């Protein structure tokens, strides 16, 4: 039933065995994809260019994914699910995309930016191919903690670890959109409410708190100076932490609480204490969201009220 | 449609035409359009978020067009209005509409008075007489509002523990505005 | 020093604190009737806005 | 096309059936019209008798007007005392004639500086009724008058003067010179001779 098809860039091939009622639509995609590929150059060493066969498959893998919906049935659902299995079976030795990215960094042609690409592609692809991340994974850590030769403690960070904190929220939203989109949107909305709900909160958010907007159009994102002042930076940092918890939980095949169970305990530094408390109150996904609400609605008030208490004033130049 | 208005033999560009010039957000509602003498076109624009009447165009007794020019942001929330009056006259096909000039400055002054001055409308001052203002206590919050309005983040104006709040020299204008502006109002200083 | 300044998005904020409810600055139909380029920023705002710059950079933020 | 130029003004519209080309004038039509679906395929040439038929029409005060393209714009009888030097120089006569409800052109020929004509234009205005208007006749072959005049006219309109048309005698300005008058001066219409 199998009928060869090559995914091509520069001196990099990946031969792709294709089913019968398929090689039609498959070739169509192959062609369209070939068009978008930037011209090869000096070991494909540009920024758009795939470094390796693996990266290329991820590329095409992501291109096909761009043309599908989970809600309605598509005509590429056939091809996508097939390139998935061949990428998985061929390039992932069963481990996580993350393990591959590391290999591709260490051994092959190092690009953090390209690594992130590859990861965006695989997770994104898989989730839009109606093919979720529910089956406990063989995390050697979590396996060994589970047995008894290891124990976990969740530590949560505070304010002031980074100049560009909001950046971490971007990379999260942008990369793992298929996993975190919910609570980003959920938070963006629930924070919006806190501001109506609250008396003079509006005055503190001089340039508004449209988190969803700033994410979509970087162009519209306010200064680091605005983003860093607590009333908006406290809640946002927490969302970042919650968001990270979730990619770890979801990607392990665990519920929020299932993840929490592997923990000997948790603790935060400064404002990170809040999420640790709220994280341990966590059980099932349906219930996960009130836990989020609690956390960020605390942070919001810490931020808004502590700013009001002692607000930054001009430094004598 | 008449491109020009009249003011004492002088020809101005048509103000009605001007004020109704299109633009996203404005909405015109003509009511009773088919009978001439009763027609009332009404312009409503977005004012502080919600829509509201800004202009009201109709006829009055004895062939007098009236353009009710409405300001919604006032001292007490109760909208104020400037009555602009125009003589319509079908015997001059070329310049039918001319403006009623007698007392035009006075009407404009009266509306500005209601917006600036918390006193009775009396335009009978001697320009040479001293104008007394009002006493004025500087609230801690009038300062917060002003500094934040102009964007002055000086620590001398921000409430800090164990320091009295200072007011910006700029704040002088907030205090004297009513005493000062009154000075351009008397009848002997007739201005538009 | 050479400093970068900006006029406000709307004029209502300055009008409220100052008591200058002049429609020229707030209502487009009045601005347009007077034949202005738009809803002109309060000349007084620029006065206090620029002054703030002088205050900060020339007086080292010593209001006094 | 031969028959077309025979008929021109009579509402007949010739179409050349055998050539798909383009007429810069729309004088007539080519192969396309015979087949077009849009209202673009139904063109008709003008009948001057009908198109430009004089008419009558009534004021509300019930005055009667000879309605033509001209009077339809100006709102008075389609008759005018053209600028004339000795005759139309006098602010008195341009007032009187304009007060009698007729369009008259104030003669530039008799004025020699912005200041001297400003004198008359202001006299004319003093005698003319409220909301009334007149015009100014300037000579092309006199570059001096044309130099203090065009400005005086523009400076005057800007102040809102009731002088709402310019006529130019002795020659027709060039496209850039004319365009200047049209857009620069605040005039209701321009008169060419």
The B-side interface with C (CB below 8 A) comprises 15, 18-19, 21, 23, 43, 45, 47-48, 54-55, 69, 71-75, 112, 115-116, 142, 145-146, 148-157, 166, 168-170, 173-174, 177-178
Could you tell me if A316 lies within 8 Å of chain C, comparing CB atoms?
Answer: yes
Contact A314 C56 (CB under 8 A): yes
Distance CA C34, CA C55 (A): 34
Cβ-in-10-Å burial (0-12, 13-18, 19+) of D12 comes to: middle
Q: Which residue of A has its CA nearest to B144?
A: A203
Nearest chain D Cα distance for residue B96, angstroms: 9
SS3 D192: strand
Query: CA torsion sign, A160 to A164 to A170 to A175?
Result: negative
Q: Find chain B residues with C-beta within 8 A of C22's C-beta.
A: 112, 115-116
Contact status, residue B67 vs residue B55, Cβ threshold 8 Å: yes
Contact status, residue B106 vs residue B96, Cβ threshold 8 Å: no
B-interface mutation test, from D131, D133, D157, D159, most B Cβ less than 10 A away: D131
Q: Which residues of A are catalytic?
A: 270
Distance CA C5, CA A15 (A): 59
**Both tokens assigned to D8:** 């021109």
Which chains does chain D touch, 3 or more C-beta pairs < 8 A?
Answer: B
Q: Find chain A residues with C-beta within 8 A of C53's C-beta.
A: none
Q: How many beta-carbon pairs below 8 A join chains A and B?
A: 10
CATH of A1-137, one of 1.20.1050.120, 3.40.30.10, 3.40.50.300, 1.10.10.10: 1.20.1050.120
CA-closest candidate to residue A263, choices A153, A148, A140: A153
Could you tell me if B48 lies within 8 Å of chain A, comparing CB atoms?
Answer: no
Q: Which residue of B has its CA nearest to D77?
A: B93
SS3 B81: strand
The residue written with tokens 């912005």 in the block is D114
CA-closest candidate to residue A109, choices A54, A147, A151: A54
Q: How far is CA B19 from CA A273, B14, B15, B22, B23, in A?
A: 59, 9, 6, 9, 11
A140-A141-A142-A147 Cα dihedral, nearest 10 degrees: 80
Q: Find chain C residues with C-beta within 8 A of A314's C-beta.
A: 56, 61
Could you tell me if A225 lies within 8 Å of chain C, comparing CB atoms?
Answer: no
Q: Find chain C residues with C-beta within 8 A of B18's C-beta.
A: 32-33, 35
- Domain limits for position B11: 1-101
Total residue length of chain C: 64
Distance CA D139, CA B143 (A): 67
Contact D76 B93 (CB under 8 A): yes
Contact status, residue A76 vs residue A64, Cβ threshold 8 Å: yes
**Both tokens assigned to D25:** 């004038």
Q: Find chain B residues with C-beta within 8 A of C48's C-beta.
A: 150, 152, 168, 170
Contact A311 B155 (CB under 8 A): no
Contact status, residue D31 vs residue D17, Cβ threshold 8 Å: yes
Strand ranges inside chain B, DSSP E? 4-7, 10-13, 27-31, 40-47, 50-60, 64-71, 80-88, 97-99
In three state form, how does the secondary structure of A43-68 look? CCCCCCCCCCHHHHHHHHHHHHHCCC
Could you tell me if C37 lies within 8 Å of chain B, comparing CB atoms?
Answer: no
Q: Which residue of B has its CA nearest to D101?
A: B92
In three state form, how does the secondary structure of B122-140 look? CCCCCCCCCCCCCCCCCCH
User: What CATH code is carried by the domain that includes residue B40?
Assistant: 3.30.1120.100
Contact status, residue A9 vs residue A37, Cβ threshold 8 Å: yes
Distance CA B168, CA B146 (A): 9
Distance CA A230, CA A252 (A): 32
**Both tokens assigned to A43:** 């070991």
CA-closest candidate to residue A83, choices A129, A38, A44, A142: A129
**Both tokens assigned to B27:** 């909405």
Q: Which residue of A has its CA nearest to B159?
A: A310
Among candidates B43, B54, B178 on the partner chain, residue whose Cβ is nearest the Cβ of C19? B178
CA-closest candidate to residue B57, choices B92, B96, B21, B31: B31
Q: How far is CA B53 from CA A127, B30, B70, in A?
A: 52, 13, 7
Q: Find chain B residues with C-beta within 8 A of C15's C-beta.
A: 73
Distance CA B22, CA C28 (A): 12
D182: how many CB neighbours lie within 10 A of its CB?
13
CA-closest candidate to residue A270, choices A238, A222, A315: A238
Q: Name every residue whose Cβ is closer than 8 Å to that of residue C22 and which is 6 or more positions away in sequence.
A: B112, B115, B116, C15
């Amino acid at each position: 039933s199998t009928r060869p098809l090559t995914l091509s860039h520069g001196s990099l091939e990946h031969v792709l065995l294709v089913p019968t009622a398929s090689f039609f639509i498959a070739s169509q995609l192959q062609e369209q994809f070939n068009k978008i590929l930037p011209e090869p150059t000096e070991g494909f060493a540009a920024d758009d260019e795939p470094t390796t066969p693996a990266e290329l498959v991820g590329k095409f893998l992501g291109y096909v994914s761009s043309l599908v919906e989970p809600s309605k049935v598509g005509q590429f659902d056939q091809v996508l699910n097939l390139c998935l299995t061949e990428f998985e079976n061929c390039y992932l030795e069963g481990n996580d995309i993350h393990a591959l990215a590391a290999k591709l960094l260490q051994e092959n042609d190092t690009t953090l930016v390209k690594t992130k690409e590859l990861i965006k592609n695989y997770i994104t692809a898989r989730i839009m191919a109606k093919r979720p991340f529910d089956k406990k994974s063989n995390s050697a850590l979590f396996r060994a903690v589970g047995e008894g030769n290891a124990q976990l403690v969740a530590i949560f960070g505070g304010q002031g670890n980074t100049d560009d904190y909001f950046e971490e929220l971007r990379d999260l939203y942008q990369t793992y959109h298929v996993l975190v989109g919910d609570l980003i949107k959920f938070s963006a909305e629930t924070l919006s409410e806190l501001i109506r709900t609250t008396l003079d909160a509006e005055k503190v958010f001089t340039q508004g708190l449209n988190i969803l907007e700033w994410l979509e159009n970087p162009s519209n994102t306010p200064d680091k100076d605005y983003l860093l002042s607590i009333p908006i930076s406290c809640p946002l940092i927490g969302v970042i932490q919650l968001a990270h918890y979730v990619v770890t939980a979801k990607l392990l095949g665990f519920t929020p609480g299932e993840l929490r169970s592997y923990l000997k305990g948790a603790t935060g530094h400064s404002q990170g204490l809040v999420t640790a408390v709220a994280i341990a109150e966590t059980d099932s996904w349906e219930s996960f969201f009130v836990s989020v609400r609690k956390a960020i609605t605390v942070l919001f008030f810490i931020g808004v009220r502590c700013y009001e208490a002692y607000p930054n004033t001009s430094l004598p130049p | 449609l008449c491109s020009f208005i009249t003011q004492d033999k002088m020809f101005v560009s048509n103000p009605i035409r001007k004020v109704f010039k299109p633009s996203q957000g404005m909405v015109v509602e003509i009511s009773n359009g088919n009978t001439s003498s009763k027609t009332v076109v009404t312009l409503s624009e977005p004012v502080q978020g919600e829509l509201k009447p800004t202009v009201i165009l109709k006829l009055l007794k004895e062939n007098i067009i009236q353009m009710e020019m409405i300001e919604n942001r006032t001292m007490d929330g109760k909208p104020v209005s400037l009555p602009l009056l125009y003589n319509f006259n079908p015997d001059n096909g070329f310049a039918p509409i001319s403006e009623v000039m007698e007392d035009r400055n006075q009407r404009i002054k009266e509306m500005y008075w209601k917006l600036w001055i918390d006193e009775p409308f009396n335009l009978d001052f001697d320009p040479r007489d001293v104008i007394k203002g009002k006493d004025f206590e500087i609230t801690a919050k009038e300062v917060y509002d002003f500094t934040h309005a102009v964007g002055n983040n000086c620590e001398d104006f921000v409430s800090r523990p164990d320091r009295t709040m200072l007011a910006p020299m700029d704040f002088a204008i907030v205090v004297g505005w009513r005493a000062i502006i009154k000075a351009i109002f008397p009848n002997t200083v007739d201005g538009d | 020093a050479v400093l970068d300044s900006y006029t406000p998005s709307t004029n209502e904020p300055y009008a409220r604190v100052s008591g200058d409810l002049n429609p020229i600055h707030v209502s487009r139909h009045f601005a347009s009737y007077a034949n202005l380029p738009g809803t002109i920023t309060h000349g007084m705002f620029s006065s206090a806005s620029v002054r703030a710059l002088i205050e900060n950079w020339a007086a080292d933020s010593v209001s006094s | 096309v031969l028959t077309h130029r025979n008929k021109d003004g009579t509402g007949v519209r010739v179409i050349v059936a055998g050539t798909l080309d383009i007429n810069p004038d729309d004088d007539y039509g080519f192969k396309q019209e015979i087949f077009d679906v849009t209202s673009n395929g139904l063109k008709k040439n003008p009948n001057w008798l009908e198109e430009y038929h004089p008419k009558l029409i009534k004021n509300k005060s019930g005055k009667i007007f000879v309605e033509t393209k001209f009077s339809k714009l100006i709102g008075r009888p389609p008759l005018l005392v053209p600028g004339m030097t000795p005759c139309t120089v006098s602010p008195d006569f341009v007032a009187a004639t304009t007060n009698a409800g007729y369009t008259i052109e104030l003669a530039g020929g008799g004025y020699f500086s912005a200041a001297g004509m400003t004198a008359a234009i202001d006299s004319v205005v003093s005698q003319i009724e409220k909301g009334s208007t007149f015009g100014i006749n300037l000579i092309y072959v006199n570059p001096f008058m044309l130099q203090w005049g065009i400005p005086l006219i523009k400076e005057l309109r800007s102040k809102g003067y009731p002088i709402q048309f310019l006529t130019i005698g002795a020659g027709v300005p060039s496209l850039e010179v004319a365009s200047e008058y049209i857009e620069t001066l605040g005039l209701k219409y321009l008169g060419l001779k």
